Amino acid sequence: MNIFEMLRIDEGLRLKIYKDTEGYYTIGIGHLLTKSPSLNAAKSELDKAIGRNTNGVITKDEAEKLFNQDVDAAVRGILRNAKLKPVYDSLDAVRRAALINMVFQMGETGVAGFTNSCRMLQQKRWDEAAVNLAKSRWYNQTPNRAKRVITTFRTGTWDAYKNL
Numbered sequence: 191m192n193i194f195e196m197l198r199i200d201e202g203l204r205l206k207i208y209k210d211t212e213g214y215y216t217i218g219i220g221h222l223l224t225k226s227p228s229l230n231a232a233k234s235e236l237d238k239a240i241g242r243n244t245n246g247v248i249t250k251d252e253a254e255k256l257f258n259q260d261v262d263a264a265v266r267g268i269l270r271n272a273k274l275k276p277v278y279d280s281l282d283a284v285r286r287a288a289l290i291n292m293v294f295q296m297g298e299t300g301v302a303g304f305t306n307s308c309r310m311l312q313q314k315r316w317d318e319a320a321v322n323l324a325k326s327r328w329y330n331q332t333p334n335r336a337k338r339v340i341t342t343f344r345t346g347t348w349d350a351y352k353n354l
């Protein structure tokens with residue numbers, strides 16, 4: 191298990207445009223295209239991202255290329271966030287993957303709340319952080335994924351994924 195395998199489990203793989211859990215046009219391994227309700231806008235985003243006329247369908251290799259870029263993006267963005275880099279750098283590599291997972295799902299900027307959860311993680315108060323992370327829209331709207339990510343923070347193991 192590693193961040194790529196972890197996110198592949200949590201995001202799935204679909205080769206045609208679909209709507210994510212929030213209703214937003216997405217493709218591949220959780221590649222958000224746009225928040226616009228226009229399918230035509232989503233197809234323009236897709237064609238721009240792949241560099242060809244796709245009409246909303248891609249190959250597995252193309253999906254994996256966007257995924258590689260999106261993981262790389264998430265990591266770089268954590269480092270570029272002065273509010274988050276210290277937390278990331280304080281963690282072991284397994285818990286770092288849990289943090290990347292959250293940023294991938296929620297965004298590299300603009301995420302609301304979670305200051306207290308990040309403090310408890312920096313303090314290495316793992317059970318307390320896990321309780322605090324669940325007091326969230328995130329946990330209520332995507333509870334099975336959030337439970338897996340939270341277990342990863344609580345334990346520093348891959349137990350919630352190994353077997354999936």
Ligand SMILES: *SCC1=CC(C)(C)N(O)C1(C)C
Binds near residue numbers: 289292293297307311
């Ligand atoms: S560690 C909690 C946290 C704080 C913030 C910077 C808002 N992040 O996006 C997450 C959710 C990772």
Ligand SMILES: [Cl-]
Binds near residue numbers: 234
């Ligand atoms: Cl565009």
Ligand SMILES: [Cl-]
Binds near residue numbers: 318321322
């Ligand atoms: Cl709490």
Ligand SMILES: [Cl-]
Binds near residue numbers: 332333334336
């Ligand atoms: Cl879920």
Ligand SMILES: [K+]
Binds near residue numbers: 200201202211219220
């Ligand atoms: K998804």
